[model samples]
Target: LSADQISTVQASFDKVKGDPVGILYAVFKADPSIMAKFTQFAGKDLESIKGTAPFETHANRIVGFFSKIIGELPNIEADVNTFVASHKPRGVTHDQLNNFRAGFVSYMKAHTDFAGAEAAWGATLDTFFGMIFSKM
Candidate 1:
């Protein structure tokens, strides 16, 4: 990614860094099947469980991984590899991963100045997910 794209990616991530709940909510909202991978969350009502501690804890764990990735920026290949290895065994598939991306992008679009940052996000996600997909 270009420097500007990196900057935007970091800034965009910062905007939602503290909103782990929202991030995971959007992800599960777009693709409920992903939630099934979590034993504690499986078959539970999303809306009712959303504000619970367990949900927030998992959200933090999920979003925190992304935070670490974004924080590392140019040196994220190792992390991506680890992420894929960890997730693949959990039955995560390409379709679900793509849905996660779509959900995140949609969240940014709805909550941020996504129109202005589209190109930057495109480059950012393309680079990040490219490494991830390769490992997958």
Candidate 2:
């Protein structure tokens, strides 16, 4: 992505990064099976645990990744490689990852003026997930 697009993506992400619970909730809502990928989260009611500390804890991990990603844009290869190394073993299938992408977008669409930077955000998500898919 170009510098301007990077800035646009970062700015957009900054708008909703603080609401990790919402973002993770979107992810799980879009695909509950993803939650089962976690031992602690297995069969737990999302509505029950959404505002709890464990939910926020998990939220931080999701947010932390995007935070790190936004921080590294335009210089993402090494970081993306490391990410692939770490998450590849999780068996995060394409469908699950796609659900994550859709969930984040769905969350942002509700929480931010996403129309102002759709292309930039789309490019950013594409680049980020493209790497993961390649290495998967």
Candidate 3:
């Protein structure tokens, strides 16, 4: 990604960074199967778990991972490799990963200045997911 694109992407992400739970809720709401991968969350009612401590902890972890990758902008291959190492072994599928992308994009569209940042985010995800898929 170009420097300007990185800046635009990061700036946009900042708008929703404080709400990890909401971001994750969006994902699980979009695809319950993705939530099912979690032993703690599987088969649980989404609304019931929304305000739980465990839910917030896991949401923070997920969002923090993204923060780390974005902070290290334009240099996420190592991070993507780490994701593959951990997730591929757990049988995370391409469909689930794509759903993650869809869910996240939907959240950004709803919560951020998405029109201003969509192209930057699109390029960012393409690069990130491209590396991830290649490794997977």
Candidate 4:
């Protein structure tokens, strides 16, 4: 990605960095199946569960995971490998991870100023997923 593209991706991400609740909510809303994969959230009402302890904990795990990655985007390849090594054994599929990406992009578009960040974010995601996809 170009320097301009990296800046756009980071700036857009910065706009929504601390929005864990909203981010997690968007993921569940976009793909309930993803939500269902979590034993703590499966079959629960998304609206009702939003404020629960379990929801927040898992949200932290899920969204916090992204926060760490975004924070390290300048050197994301190693982090991507870490994710593959950690989650691959937990049965995370390419489809699920891709769904997560799509859901997150949708959330960013709705909540943040998409402006012209789409292509930049796409390139960023491609770089991230390329490593994980190799393992999958």
**TM-scores of all candidate predictions against the true structure:** 0.95, 0.94, 0.97, 0.89
A best-first ranking of the candidates according to their TM-score comes to: 3, 1, 2, 4
The C-alpha local distance difference test score for the whole of candidate 3 amounts to 0.92
Give lDDT: candidate 3, residue 10. Answer: 88
Alpha-carbon runs more than 4 Å astray in model 3:
none
C-alpha lDDT of residue 82 in model 2: 82
- Per-residue lDDT over 1-136 for candidate 3, one digit per residue giving the tens place of the 0 to 100 score: 8999999998888888999999999999888999999999999999999999999999999999999999888988888888888899999888999999999999988886689888999999999989898988
Residue 102, candidate 2: alpha-carbon lDDT: 91
- Clashes by residue pair, model 1: none
- Judged by TM-score, which candidate is best? 3
Give the CA lDDT, 0 to 100, for residue 17 in model 2.
79
Give one digit per residue, the lDDT tens place, for model 4 in 17-42.
Answer: 77788889987887788888788888
For residues 28-127, write the lDDT of model 2, one tens digit per residue: 9999889999887898888998989888998898788778878888787888888778888887789999998898889888887789989998888898
Candidate 2: 10-residue stretch with minimal lDDT: 74-83
Error of 3 at 36 (Å): 0.6
Write candidate 1's Cα lDDT for 9-63 as tens digits: 8887788789999889999999999988889999999998999999999999989
Instruction: Please report, as a residue range, the 10-residue window in candidate 1 with the lowest summed lDDT.
Output: 1-10
Ranking by lDDT: 3, 1, 2, 4
Error (Å) of candidate 3 at residue 13 is 0.8
